[PDB]
Design a protein around this ligand. Structure first.
Ligand code: 7IO
Ligand code: F
Lengths: 321, 107
């Protein structure tokens, strides 16, 4: 074998910020061998890489999205964010050759995003609850503030969607992409919004965002945007659960009323002017699991943001199902 | 560029060459004394290959002037370190760096 005495795995180097030690981040980054391109978009590219035979995910940002790479790198390096349902951060690096390249290295999840997973596979009661409860547990971990040295401030994602949720090998999910995140500390009540010209996904935008009525100086408003988007993700997942031999094809939220890559006015007319919500199929109430999920979606879609459930309330309900 | 202040001498004969792996113990500090990284705190030596650009330029040119067993003080200038961008959340822009590095062995 190619193993020599003193070789360390990634798990050994990570045991120590959320990822590797600072100087170790640069060494591991520039020893990664890119293998296959698994994503490409306005954000940049996502590559499956390899460090010492171990799979890793490498997000190579575009020059227009440098502020998202800054926020996610700053967040992961300053806040201890290690959780089963949050994407595991490994390292962040920048190179001045090939002009500049910005790299974010995370765990690699071969199943891909929840968006891709739901299009190929159907679910049962066990796999649906595992997916849905994991997202709630990761979102609740982000929203709740933990005190102490190993603690974390309250965090809101602000771009939660099935494409930003990865399916792990054990069937659970993890939340990714913290470039639009905001922070809040209860000790000083300060809100950290950041500096990023990136806008959220319009299809998942909450009503208070589309009519510009959201209270931008209140951290609770950003958490309730996540709950709205989470409810739409619940609607995507529950469609793929089989009950009585019936299942729905995968469809994005509002597939039947807006086109692909919708505009602000497309969403504002559907969500705000017409007050439309995704339709709940009637066959779901013949199944106790989808009945509980249907009840949770409607409680994420209240026009009044304060009426929506909390991420912690959703996890407790899913734990009892 | 990079200032090398010797703390304890090495053998004075074995200096790192291109391709060799440098096994070091280090403690990184800002010029205000704030420590941001230390291999000593975790009792795990740090390894890197000279000439592969796996560390900052000040580390390469600084460790290349040390002998095995030497403990040196490396004061790295921003242009030899992380420059104007730095590292978000660890290294501020235009940060002058102070490294307590001991070259343990070469492989
Ligand atoms: C947001 C979302 C993911 C990430 C990731 C990331 C971590 O792990 C990842 C795995 C994939 C992937 C997707 C599809 C397939 N395919 C699809 C077709 N069928 C076979 C599997 C494989 C891998 C993508 N991104 C990441 C890294 C950094 N920032 C992100 C921000
Ligand atoms: F999307």
């Amino acid at each position: 074998m190619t193993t020599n005495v003193g070789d360390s795995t990634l798990a050994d180097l990570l045991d120590h910020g959320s990822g590797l030690p600072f100087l170790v981040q640069r060494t591991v980054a520039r020893q990664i061998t890119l293998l296959e391109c698994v994503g490409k978009g306005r954000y940049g590219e996502v590559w499956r890489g390899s460090w010492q035979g171990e799979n890793v995910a490498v997000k190579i940002f575009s020059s227009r999205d440098e502020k998202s790479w800054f926020r996610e790198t700053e967040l992961y390096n300053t806040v201890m964010l290690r959780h089963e349902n949050i994407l595991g951060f490994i390292a962040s690096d920048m190179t001045s050759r090939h002009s500049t390249q910005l790299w974010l290295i995370t765990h690699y999840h071969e199943m891909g995003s929840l968006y891709d997973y739901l299009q190929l596979t159907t679910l049962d009661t066990v796999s649906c609850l595992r997916i849905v409860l994991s997202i709630a547990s990761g979102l609740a971990h982000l929203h709740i503030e933990i005190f102490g040295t190993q603690g974390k401030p309250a965090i809101a994602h602000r771009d939660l969607k099935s494409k930003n949720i990865l399916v792990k090998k054990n069937g659970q999910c993890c939340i990714a992409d913290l470039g639009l995140a905001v922070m809040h500390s209860q000790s000083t009540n300060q809100l950290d919004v950041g500096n990023n010209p990136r806008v959220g996904t319009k299809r998942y935008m909450a009503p208070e965002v589309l009519d510009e009525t959201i209270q931008v100086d209140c951290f609770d408003s950003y958490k309730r945007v996540d709950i709205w988007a989470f409810g739409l993700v619940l609607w995507e997942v529950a469609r793929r659960m089989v009950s009585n031999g019936i299942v729905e094809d995968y469809k994005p939220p509002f597939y039947d009323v807006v086109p692909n890559d919708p505009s602000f006015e497309d969403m504002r007319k559907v969500v705000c002017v017409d007050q439309q919500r995704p339709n709940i199929p009637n066959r779901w109430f013949s199944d106790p699991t989808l009945t509980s999920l249907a009840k949770l979606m409607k409680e994420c879609w209240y026009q009044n943001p304060s009426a929506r459930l909390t991420a912690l309330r959703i996890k407790k309900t899913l734990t009892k199902i | 560029g990079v200032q090398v202040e010797t703390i304890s001498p090495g053998d004075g004969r074995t200096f790192p060459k291109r391709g060799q792996t440098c096994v070091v113990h280090y403690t990184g500090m800002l010029e205000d004394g704030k420590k941001f990284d230390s291999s000593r705190d975790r009792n795990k030596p740090f390894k890197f290959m000279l000439g592969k650009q796996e560390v900052i330029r000040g580390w390469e040119e600084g460790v290349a002037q040390m002998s095995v067993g030497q403990r040196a003080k490396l004061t790295i200038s921003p242009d030899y370190a992380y420059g104007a961008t730095g590292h978000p959340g660890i290294i501020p822009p235009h940060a002058t760096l102070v490294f307590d590095v001991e070259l343990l062995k070469l492989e």
